[PDB]
Amino acid sequence: RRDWENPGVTQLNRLAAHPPFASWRNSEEARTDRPSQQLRSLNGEWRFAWFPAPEAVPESWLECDLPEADTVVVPSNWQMHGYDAPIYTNVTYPITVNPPFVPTENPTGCYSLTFNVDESWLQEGQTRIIFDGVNSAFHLWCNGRWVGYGQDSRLPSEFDLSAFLRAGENRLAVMVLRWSDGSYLEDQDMWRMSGIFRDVSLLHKPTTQISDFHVATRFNDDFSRAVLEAEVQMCGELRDYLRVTVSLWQGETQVASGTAPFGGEIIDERGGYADRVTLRLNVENPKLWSAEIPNLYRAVVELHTADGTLIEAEACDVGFREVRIENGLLLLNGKPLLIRGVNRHEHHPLHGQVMDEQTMVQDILLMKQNNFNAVRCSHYPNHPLWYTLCDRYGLYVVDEANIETHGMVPMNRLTDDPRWLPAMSERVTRMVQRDRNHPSVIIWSLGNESGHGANHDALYRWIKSVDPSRPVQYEGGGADTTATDIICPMYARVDEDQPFPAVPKWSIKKWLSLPGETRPLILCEYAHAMGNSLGGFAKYWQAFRQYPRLQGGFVWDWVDQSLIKYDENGNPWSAYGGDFGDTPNDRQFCMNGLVFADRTPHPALTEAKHQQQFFQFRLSGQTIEVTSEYLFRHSDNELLHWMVALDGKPLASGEVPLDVAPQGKQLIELPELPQPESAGQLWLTVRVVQPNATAWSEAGHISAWQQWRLAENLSVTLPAASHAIPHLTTSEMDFCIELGNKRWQFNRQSGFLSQMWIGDKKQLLTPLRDQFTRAPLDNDIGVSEATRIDPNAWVERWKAAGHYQAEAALLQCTADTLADAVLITTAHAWQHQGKTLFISRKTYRIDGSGQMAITVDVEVASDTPHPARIGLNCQLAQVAERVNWLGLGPQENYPDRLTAACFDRWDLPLSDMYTPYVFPSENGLRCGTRELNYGPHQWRGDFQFNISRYSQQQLMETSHRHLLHAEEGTWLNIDGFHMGIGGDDSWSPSVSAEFQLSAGRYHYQLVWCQK
């Protein structure tokens, strides 16, 4: 038969889709969501064995536990237990392309479980089982009898067990296949696993019962009145005594109650639905549900007789809300939304694709914590608890059908074929049937990266038809096809057009005004958070902010899909593509997250928090202007703390409770701010504080901040004549500078300061040389593999030009004795194949103060690529536990990424001065640095630096962070200038011209002193 190879057989004997039931027996357990006794978890230890093919499975198996069968926990992913490898392929299908045929070698997993039933369940009512998540397909036998078949790994499969079930002991036999024709629709850029990864349960429902029910909430102009309307459907023997009651609860307060009997109104010629009923409850001044204040009534549906006898009950949480596109705009509850969002996969580093309440909530807090308001179920329906939690905590949700044919050719190859309609069809409807009643769900998605076929069109309209409460979006075939209510491109740039043929990506700004165009624009994907990323994220935030029809988007993505591995010794290490021996694999494109798989923030995470703050500020001299981005709430837990400091010295602070309405303004007037008996930079800094604790935030939680330079006083002081003076020892190839205990040596042949002594002690491990390169970022690399070169790749360019192989050439080197200092002169050329790429002209002026002042003058050939950096490097001998600087911090920060960084005096352990990106690259850069203090040293200027125990060479040459070793001393990279990082996408250049080193001439002056 081989159903798993038939697009036309996607299930056999699978019950109908519906919202989550619990068949509660008491209205109160119901109203309270107390656990239902009619709901039984089959989770725990299960019996299990593996076979390379299903053909290989022993018939005994159906009748009796195999011997060699191990015990495992379920849910779980069999790759997680080590039965076979998990594959990390993005686009290219993990199997060969032959629809609709899976391979002969199809890792089949036979799971089994022996359990008991209560004789009570079998006398009356209906008993059925549920599988919430089976990857990818499966057959099912109970008590040696063949139950049925199911396809689609992200939606709930249920079968009626009533007829196989017996008193007490029963046995379940579950035959799981990895590959199935279902697979063709599941081409997701993620680890490819398999198994019983979701919850198995048992539900006992009465013979006569609740088959389904939907809930919808219609309002009035101003939303002062509303109507909740419920459609209840029943199954089983229909009797005139049979009644329904829908009650609406606000805690312990009944808000409304409705009672009726079955019998629909006339729908057509044949009549109406007798097994149906629609109640309409009016609610006065309803509490509106939103991501900002998730007001939530609770609805209880009860099937019962005219006599009061309660047949059974079901329930759900109700959110009063209206979602609508009107006049080119998305409305929430009548106000125009701003999507501060994020894509998220359900992923656990140890657990595989198994999801737990704990993880779930972790994510959510953090999410909420970060100025986030929406999540995108990229790209299959999520674990059911999730909707609820969002509904609960308050996040807007994009529920996506589980469909992605990315690997096809072209993409719409399946989706444009009728033969695949059904299959796809089953994938959209069921989600819908299941997820309907959840307020958090605000928009529907047809899936991902599967072109644009007629199949989309239909399903689009099907939705449209059954659920008009929400908009449909779909990006494929152009982000603007007829199967989307919303212009939802991915990787679309702010200003620049990506005119691909057929599927051009237009600047989002330009995109909205195309002749004919009128829809709202929301990015399904944008700001690829791959490694050292999110550069120019602000450039999006700005646009959004300015463009009304630019209603935001969802960052890609939330958390790194990294896996836990263990070495010989037992230390756990973060794994990725081709680490499990998976091939083909897509290396690290599985790591795009804003946080590490441990829910540990990436430094870009702050940049998002920052640009997604809900308070905006302007400063008019002494006046502060706070503006509200809340659509619905009042600044009722915010207090403004403000402060003024001088180059880090706080000349004043103060706090001011904010009292701003949504979308409103507040005027805060600062008290005259003292003058400064000194030179330097005046800076005023502000922060919003959440004095109290929320269900998501802590008390004293920081919601936003902003900072400006108030004024600056120039240093017109003239040193102080040097008491003592520096001495110069000329040698045949050295230049000695001695003063105090201190002394400098400049090797006359190389042209470089080669050694620094303070006392008897040597300060350098490595001379101090110029630098034009960086250890390549994921961004810089792209899809440049060692086997398939991307010539446009920044790394590629640099490589090919010899940026990384230049030979500096001593052009000049002189010593000179001034009246007050010794004057050192150098000049180098960096060449390659006789091309002079760079020329470096320095000066060192050492004076009696024991101060070394380096002056740097670079020239960059017009015809060569632009260098990642322009700075100096050397390896320190010293190795100190803290780093101290006057500058932009405290987190890592680059030129096209630093709007969140604040200017201050910073203190942290040398350690925190490194960012363990699993795939090593340039990192922990700190910008606009005035002062850097490390051990006995002091650097003074305007530069960006970095300091770790790892040479660039080492980073560049290492693949996994857990392979790095600290080196002797400390690596100190000091840049006069640093190149942008990019982020728009990670498989083509994302660096804005303005962040590129196009000048051709650079100037920089450092100060090298000793404290």
Q: Which residues bind Na ion (CB under 5 A)?
A: 189, 544, 550, 589, 920
Does residue number 408 form part of the binding site for a second copy (CB under 8 A)? yes
Token pair, residue 250, equals 């606000």
Q: Would you call 781 helix, strand, or coil by DSSP?
A: helix
Site size with a second copy, rule: CB under 8 A: 56
The nearer residue to Na ion, 540 or 1004, going by C-beta atoms, is 540
Q: Which of 452, 406, 401, 443 is nearest to 424 (CA)?
A: 401
Q: Which of 494, 451, 497, 472 is nearest to 400 (CA)?
A: 472
| Residue 13, annotated as binding a ligand | no
Does residue number 269 form part of the binding site for a second copy (CB under 8 A)? yes
Pick out residues in 347-406 that bind a second copy (CB under 8 A): 406
| Residue 135, annotated as binding a ligand | no
Contact partner, 181, from Na ion, Mg ion, a second copy, none, Cβ < 5-8 Å per class:
Mg ion
Distance CA 897, CA 534 (A): 7
Contact 82, 72 (CB under 8 A): no
Q: Least CB distance from residue 544 to Na ion, whole Å?
A: 5
H helix or E strand, kind and range, residue 766:
strand 764-771
Does residue number 461 form part of the binding site for a second copy (CB under 8 A)? yes
**Dihedral sign of CA atoms 1006, 1007, 1010, 1011 in order:** negative
The nearer residue to Mg ion, 345 or 610, going by C-beta atoms, is 345
Question: Which alpha helices (H) appear in 383-524, and where do they start and end?
Answer: 384-393, 421-435, 454-466, 508-511
Site string for Mg ion, 437-456 (x = CB under 5 A): ------------x-------
Q: Which of the ranges 46-54, 187-195, 657-665, 947-955 carries the binding residues for Mg ion, by CB under 5 A?
A: 187-195
Contacts of 609 (CB under 8 A, 6+ apart): 369, 370, 371, 900
Does residue number 460 form part of the binding site for a second copy (CB under 8 A)? yes
Contacts of 44 (CB under 8 A, 6+ apart): 73, 74
Q: Which of the ranges 268-276, 529-537, 773-781, 819-827 carries the binding residues for a second copy, by CB under 8 A?
A: 268-276
The nearer residue to a second copy, 264 or 334, going by C-beta atoms, is 264
| Residue 24, annotated as binding a ligand | no
| Residue 90, annotated as binding a ligand | yes
Q: Which of 339, 436, 357, 345 is nearest to 395 (CA)?
A: 339
Distance CA 714, CA 676 (A): 12
Site string for Mg ion, 162-181 (x = CB under 5 A): -------------------x
Contact partner, 273, from Na ion, a second copy, Mg ion, none, Cβ < 5-8 Å per class:
a second copy
- How many C-beta neighbours within 10 Å does residue 250 have? 15
Does residue number 14 form part of the binding site for Mg ion (CB under 5 A)? no
> How big is the CA angle at 403 (ends 563 and 176), to the nearest 5 degrees?
60
Distance CA 879, CA 685 (A): 33
Q: Least CB distance from residue 344 to a second copy, whole Å?
A: 23
Give me the count of residues in the chain: 1011
Inter-CA distances, 903 with 539, 620, 886, 899, Å:
21, 20, 7, 11
Contact partner, 699, from Na ion, a second copy, Mg ion, none, Cβ < 5-8 Å per class:
none
Q: Are strands 764-771 and 869-876 parallel, antiparallel or unpaired?
A: antiparallel
Q: Are strands 472-473 and 441-445 parallel, antiparallel or unpaired?
A: parallel
Listed in order, strand segments (DSSP E) in 143-188 are 145-151, 157-160, 168-177
Q: Residue 781 phi/psi, 5° resolution?
A: -80, -60
* Start-to-end C-alpha separation, the chain: 82
| Residue 592, annotated as binding a ligand | yes
Token pair, residue 529, equals 């958070």
Residue holding tokens 């599988």?
Answer: 131
Find the radius of gyration of the CA atoms of the chain: 33
Q: Which of the ranges 11-19, 311-319, 328-336, 387-395 carries the binding residues for a second copy, by CB under 8 A?
A: 11-19
The nearer residue to Mg ion, 138 or 939, going by C-beta atoms, is 138
Distance CA 790, CA 792 (A): 5
Does residue number 482 form part of the binding site for a second copy (CB under 8 A)? yes
Does residue number 459 form part of the binding site for a second copy (CB under 8 A)? yes
Catalytic residue numbers?
449, 525
Contact partner, 920, from a second copy, Mg ion, Na ion, none, Cβ < 5-8 Å per class:
Na ion
Q: Which of the ranges 5-13, 41-49, 360-368, 693-701 carries the binding residues for Mg ion, by CB under 5 A?
A: 5-13
Q: Least CB distance from residue 348 to Na ion, whole Å?
A: 17
> How big is the CA angle at 967 (ends 966 and 971), to the nearest 5 degrees?
100
Does residue number 314 form part of the binding site for Mg ion (CB under 5 A)? no
| Residue 260, annotated as binding a ligand | no
Q: Fill in the amino acid letter for 48.
A: F
Q: Are strands 195-196 and 134-135 parallel, antiparallel or unpaired?
A: antiparallel
| Residue 460, annotated as binding a ligand | no
Q: Least CB distance from residue 233 to a second copy, whole Å?
A: 11
Q: Residue 58 phi/psi, 5° resolution?
A: -80, 125
Q: Which of the ranges 463-471, 692-700, 717-725, 781-789 carries the binding residues for a second copy, by CB under 8 A?
A: 463-471
Site string for Mg ion, 189-208 (x = CB under 5 A): x-------------------
Position among 220, 502, 716, 833 found at the interface with a second copy (CB under 8 A): 502
Site string for Mg ion, 398-437 (x = CB under 5 A): --------x-------------------------------
| Residue 404, annotated as binding a ligand | yes
> How big is the CA angle at 951 (ends 948 and 954), to the nearest 5 degrees?
125
Site string for Mg ion, 352-391 (x = CB under 5 A): ----------------------------------------
Q: Least CB distance from residue 54 to Na ion, whole Å?
A: 31
| Residue 735, annotated as binding a ligand | no
Does residue number 465 form part of the binding site for a second copy (CB under 8 A)? yes
Contacts with a second copy by CB under 8 A lie at 6, 8-12, 16-17, 264-274, 406, 408-413, 418-419, 421-422, 425-426, 429-430, 433, 451-452, 454-455, 457-462, 464-466, 476-478, 482, 500-503
Contacts with Mg ion by CB under 5 A lie at 3, 6, 9, 181, 189, 406, 449
